[PDB]
């Protein structure tokens, strides 16, 4: 996919009435968004709140607009349980020019917990911190349960590394 999609993140710096500003802090774009382009509780939107929005060119009116603007992790609960897993399979990125471009590759994390033992598919684009984990080290990931009941591995970062000295 990815033929036409721009998932961009921003911070609400100042709320106006029926109008607002998205800050370029995490993305090189300052977009003004209207309250009709916001999905969720506007009364649960605050100054300093980070949101994810889709940047698209509306060919209808001929103006650049934002999509429904999704609050980052609204109904998605981190299960209130932080777990750690052992990397059992890596994914090939981090080339001499491109990285994370190949989203058709995924590794595996094995975590043994709650009597359950199974491998979770993970990609590098969800790996926060921009680290380079390697199979055999120990990483931490937050199991964020979406309202659909379907989830995977998210917030994957390298906490306790295994470096061959």
Tally of CA atoms within 13 A in the half-sphere of 123 that contains its CB: 9
Please, are residues 100 and 125 in contact by the beta-carbon 8 Å criterion? yes
Elucidation method: NMR
Please, are residues 30 and 22 in contact by the beta-carbon 8 Å criterion? yes
Q: Name the helix (H) or strand (E) containing 15.
A: strand 7-16
Task: Tell me how far CA of residue 42 lies from CA of 12, 15, 129, 153, in angstroms.
Answer: 12, 10, 30, 29
């Amino acid at each position: 996919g990815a033929d036409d999609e721009e998932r961009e993140t921003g911070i609400i710096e100042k709320l106006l009435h029926s109008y607002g500003f998205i800050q370029c802090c995490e993305r090189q774009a300052r977009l003004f968004f209207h309250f009709s382009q916001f999905s969720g509780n506007i009364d649960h939107l605050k100054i300093g709140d980070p949101v994810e929005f889709e940047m698209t060119y509306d060919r209808r009116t001929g103006k650049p607009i934002a999509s429904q603007v999704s609050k980052i992790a609204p109904e998605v609960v981190l299960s209130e349980e932080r777990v750690t897993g052992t990397v059992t399979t890596e994914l090939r990125t981090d080339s001499a020019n491109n990285v994370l471009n190949s989203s058709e590759t995924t590794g595996r994390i094995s975590y043994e917990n709650r009597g359950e033992c199974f491998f979770l598919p993970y990609t590098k684009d969800d790996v926060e911190g921009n680290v380079n984990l390697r199979a055999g080290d120990k990483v931490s990931f937050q199991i964020a349960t979406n309202q659909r009941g379907n989830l995977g591995a998210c917030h994957i970062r390298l906490e306790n590394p295994a470096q061959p000295v």
